[PDB]
Design brief:
The PDB classes it as lyase. Helices cover 59% and strands 1% of the residues. The chain has 311 residues and is an all-alpha fold. Helix 12 (267-274) packs parallel to helix 14 (299-305).
Length: 311
């Protein structure tokens, strides 16, 4: 039975929860407040990915159609296309970026089940979300860290699902901006500035980059050839960081928070298949399986079976 979706409100009212300039110290009451405010967005993402995962298992046409029912409801309500309410930061825009990515990823996986009506309304919505999220970054002040790279997930998934060569080129630029930002020692300076979370955010920056390159495979393109060796350096630094945080400790100036690779760390499920040295990523692979609705759902199964299930 396909549950009723949350309201697809045009407006988003998120609240930033970091207190320091490095955006590494969390106010627990602001975080709890945000989680309540963005509950319909996280619930939307979690369900459409749940439904896409179940469709991908086979013999569950119904789950794929339930994902589409949710997507079509939010598309027809103009969800997230209204006001991005500013409380103390741009958290509302960050949510639109992540939720667009989850929505476009789910559509990419389930569109074979979509009626023409659903295709028209969802794709129009996803293209409007792509234009809105991209326009946010037209402001110079907004620094293009991992939030920028995650914006490429929704743009890329929309591009592949709609066969929009223009959005494809926009997504490639976002991917390449990330690859271009990798320094010769493997670091991403804006993620290295997050102190105790430097490892966490190098991990979180690698995830959309890898996902974009993997979606490019769906159209026969090998984006891993761009600046050959840069992504490998970044990805290896992350894998090494979970083994031993000494290098991140030294370059960030802070002792990294102890954490097991989880969720969006599942970019490793794909990258271990692309790396010339897969054994570097066995430790991270062993922490699987990995699931993240913002990346389409079960990364462990998608790496084995493909992002888009066979119709």
């Amino acid at each position: 039975d396909c549950p009723a979706p949350p309201p697809g409100s045009p407006d988003i009212r998120a609240i930033g929860y970091y207190t320091d300039a490095a955006r590494s110290v969390i106010d627990p009451r602001l975080k709890t407040q945000n989680d309540a405010a963005v509950k319909p967005l996280n619930a939307f993402a979690a369900h459409v990915a749940k439904f896409a995962d179940a469709y991908a298992k086979g013999a569950d046409e119904a789950a794929g159609r339930c994902a589409l029912t949710w997507l079509d409801a939010w598309a027809r309500s103009g969800a997230m296309l209204g006001r991005m309410a500013h409380v103390n930061n741009d958290q509302s825009d960050y949510m639109r970026q992540w939720t667009h990515g989850a929505a476009a990823m789910a559509y990419l996986r389930t569109q074979a089940l979509a009626s023409e009506q659903q295709r028209t309304d969802i794709e129009t919505w996803l293209k409007r979300l792509s234009a809105a999220n991209l326009a946010y970054w037209d402001n110079p002040k907004h620094k293009r860290n991992n939030h920028y790279y995650w914006t490429g997930v929704g743009i890329m998934a929309t591009a592949v699902a709609t066969r929009d060569d223009t959005l494809l080129n926009t997504a490639q630029g976002i991917y390449r901006a990330g690859i271009d930002a990798i320094e010769p020692d493997g670091r991403l300076p804006m993620e290295m500035a997050r102190k105790r979370l430097a490892l966490h955010y190098h991990d979180y920056a690698t995830a959309p980059l890898v996902l974009m390159a993997e979606m490019a495979r769906l159209q026969g393109e090998d984006w891993y050839t761009y600046r050959q060796g840069a992504l490998e350096r970044l990805a290896a630094r992350v894998a090494d960081g979970y083994r031993d945080p000494s290098w991140f400790n030294t370059q960030s100036g802070a002792v990294q928070e102890t954490a097991t690779p989880k969720a969006s760390s599942g970019w490793v499920e794909f990258y271990r298949l692309r790396s010339p040295d897969p054994m570097r990523f066995d430790a991270m692979h062993a922490a699987g399986p990995f699931q993240d609705p913002r990346m389409g759902g079960n990364l462990t199964l998608m790496a084995q079976e493909g992002i888009v299930p066979l119709p």
